[PDB]
Amino acid sequence: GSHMKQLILALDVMDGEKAMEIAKKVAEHVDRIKVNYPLVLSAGVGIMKRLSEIKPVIADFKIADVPYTSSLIARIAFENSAESVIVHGFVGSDTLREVCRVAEEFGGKVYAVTELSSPGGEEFMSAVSLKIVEKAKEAGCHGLIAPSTRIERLREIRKAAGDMEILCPGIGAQKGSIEAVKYADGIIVGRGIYASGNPAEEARKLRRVLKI
Amino acid sequence: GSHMKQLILALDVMDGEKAMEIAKKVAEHVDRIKVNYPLVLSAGVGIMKRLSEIKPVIADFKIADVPYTSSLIARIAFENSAESVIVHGFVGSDTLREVCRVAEEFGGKVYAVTELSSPGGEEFMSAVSLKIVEKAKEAGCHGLIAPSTRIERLREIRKAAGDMEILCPGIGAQKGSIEAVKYADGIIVGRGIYASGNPAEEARKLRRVLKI
Numbered sequence: 001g002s003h004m005k006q007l008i009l010a011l012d013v014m015d016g017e018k019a020m021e022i023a024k025k026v027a028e029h030v031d032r033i034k035v036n037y038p039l040v041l042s043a044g045v046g047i048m049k050r051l052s053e054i055k056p057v058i059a060d061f062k063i064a065d066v067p068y069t070s071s072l073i074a075r076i077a078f079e080n081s082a083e084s085v086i087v088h089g090f091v092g093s094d095t096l097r098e099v100c101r102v103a104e105e106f107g108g109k110v111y112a113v114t115e116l117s118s119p120g121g122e123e124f125m126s127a128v129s130l131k132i133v134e135k136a137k138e139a140g141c142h143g144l145i146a147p148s149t150r151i152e153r154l155r156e157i158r159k160a161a162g163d164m165e166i167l168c169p170g171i172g173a174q175k176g177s178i179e180a181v182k183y184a185d186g187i188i189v190g191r192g193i194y195a196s197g198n199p200a201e202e203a204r205k206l207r208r209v210l211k212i
Numbered sequence: 213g214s215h216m217k218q219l220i221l222a223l224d225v226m227d228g229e230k231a232m233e234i235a236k237k238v239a240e241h242v243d244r245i246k247v248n249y250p251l252v253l254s255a256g257v258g259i260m261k262r263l264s265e266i267k268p269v270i271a272d273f274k275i276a277d278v279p280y281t282s283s284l285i286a287r288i289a290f291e292n293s294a295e296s297v298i299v300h301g302f303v304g305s306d307t308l309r310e311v312c313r314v315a316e317e318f319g320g321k322v323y324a325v326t327e328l329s330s331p332g333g334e335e336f337m338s339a340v341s342l343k344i345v346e347k348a349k350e351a352g353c354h355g356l357i358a359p360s361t362r363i364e365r366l367r368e369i370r371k372a373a374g375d376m377e378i379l380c381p382g383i384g385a386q387k388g389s390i391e392a393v394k395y396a397d398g399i400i401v402g403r404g405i406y407a408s409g410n411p412a413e414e415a416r417k418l419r420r421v422l423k424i
């Protein structure tokens with residue numbers, strides 16, 4: 001798009017003090033911080049509250065259960081200051097709707113995964129990815145996760161999604177295409193930022209390369 | 213089957229001490245304790261070590277990410293005394309293989325989800341459930357999660373699985389069929405045990421009803 005785009009740090013380290021260090025030093029160059037289970041299991045879910053004072057936090061919990069337990073997971077995420085949560089579309093509309101319902105209580109957002117950026121995502125997810133877009137839209141999801149590693153599919157997802165927010169992982173370690181910026185609203189980068197000698201410099205340079 | 217079957221407590225409460233009280237109370241009647249994110253996020257991942265002193269612990273983390281992240285999550289589960297982990301087959305063979313590889317380091321087991329017992333599981337998972345069985349078997353998974361709520365499909369899954377271990381949730385709150393015992397090696401029950409006035413009595417009576 002023509003509009004301002006985000007750089008989102010996937011803070012996949014396994015020490016909370018290290019996470020805080022990295023977030024603080026790259027803060028000038030990143031718009032939101034995505035936290036996944038390796039960090040939350042290592043540091044405690046409370047790490048999201050601490051990180052949220054630096055940038056808004058996406059709870060990347062890949063919620064993928066029946067509605068009852070999915071509801072509880074979403075609630076815990078929002079109780080711990082997450083601005084948004086990530087849910088798998090493949091587990092069905094009932095879970096999508098319930099996670100969206102919990103989110104609304106908190107003014108939070110829900111992102112539905114279409115297909116993973118890894119090769120494994122092609123085995124089952126790719127076949128239903130566009131249908132997931134449809135279901136996520138109908139369920140009231142606020143956005144989508146879609147892969148930079150399959151640019152032709154990312155374009156197709158954008159066409160099906162309209163102006164729905166799309167966040168794209170895969171650039172850097174997974175060798176995704178920087179052309180993803182044409183279709184994405186936010187670019188997610190983990191290793192390309194934190195697994196470096198100078199994370200702040202890498203984040204700075206990524207913005208330049210992506211032209212965002 | 214003709215062999216001894218397990219009753220597995222899905223301990224989906226959100227206080228560690230409460231979990232320990234319930235686990236101790238029902239220990240005489242249950243064979244393993246399944247722990248999911250509502251408890252682990254609430255009490256800390258260390259609750260698995262405490263629970264493992266009562267019965268072996270299945271880390272029901274619905275692992276559903278790219279291999280890199282999935283590997284880290286599996287490792288953390290096993291470092292915290294889990295005897296096994298649960299992974300979604302839907303995310304692909306690369307993640308299945310990696311989670312199995314981590315499990316082998318610890319002598320742990322991996323169960324692959326075929327299709328969720330909730331209605332949403334019919335939307336996308338049902339259509340590829342049998343292929344997931346094939347991929348899980350090929351990847352080296354030690355078992356499957358399959359639904360008591362769709363008994364005809366459970367039968368098909370058992371036939372495709374050969375002698376892979378199958379654990380079946382859905383009995384009690386989700387109104388799954390007790391005929392699942394015929395195909396399952398273990399029966400998972402959450403609310404039917406813990407959401408009651410007398411969990412030990414409910415677990416005792418469940419064994420009789422299931423004839424296990």
Ligand SMILES: O=c1cc(O)n([C@@H]2O[C@H](COP(=O)(O)O)[C@@H](O)[C@H]2O)c(=O)[nH]1
Nearest residue numbers: 010116117169173189190191277278281
């Ligand atoms: O399709 C997806 C969806 C994701 O959330 N992710 C997540 O985005 C991050 C990518 O990190 P990295 O840039 O180091 O490859 C990880 O946290 C991963 O779990 C992904 O890689 N592919």
Ligand SMILES: O=c1cc(O)n([C@@H]2O[C@H](COP(=O)(O)O)[C@@H](O)[C@H]2O)c(=O)[nH]1
Nearest residue numbers: 065066069222328329381385401402403
């Ligand atoms: O297909 C599945 C797979 C599951 O792991 N589960 C899990 O099994 C447990 C079922 O609990 P309950 O008996 O209260 O319905 C929950 O922890 C749930 O996440 C399920 O219900 N269906």
